[PDB]
Design a protein around this ligand. Sequence first.
Ligand SMILES: [Mg+2]
Ligand SMILES: [Mg+2]
Length: 132
Amino acid sequence: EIIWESLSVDVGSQGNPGIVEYKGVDTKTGEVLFEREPIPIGTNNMGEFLAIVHGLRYLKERNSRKPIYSNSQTAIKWVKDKKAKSTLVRNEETALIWKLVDEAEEWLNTHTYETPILKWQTDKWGEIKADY
RNA sequence: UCGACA
DNA sequence: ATGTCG
Ligand SMILES: [Mg+2]
Ligand SMILES: [Mg+2]
């Protein structure tokens, strides 16, 4: 019941809030299809959200109907709402991530997609294929 | 508390 | 352990 023909995304950090990165892999092979350069300050949930949105953009530009797996219940909801409810403060250090997030929201209400966004069942299946 | 993450 | 989230 794992949909192997899929794109899997995850965040990695150093600290939380701290340095954030995310990437997307082919669920079947583990091939790395995209990896975001680390962002100096962010939260886990912002990174989880950016990874799904980047996944959507990636698949849409390639005309791909694959679903996206994420392990982040929060990020899956934020994507469905088109709104990332982060508590992270706004200052010059977090400006970069907040600009990414705002641009991701903006992409979500200027585009259509039917990509299913699916919860990766870590408890059953082990770690997501995009894990750091 | 429970759930999902970092 | 603590921080991010619902
Ligand atoms: Mg994750
Ligand atoms: Mg992980």
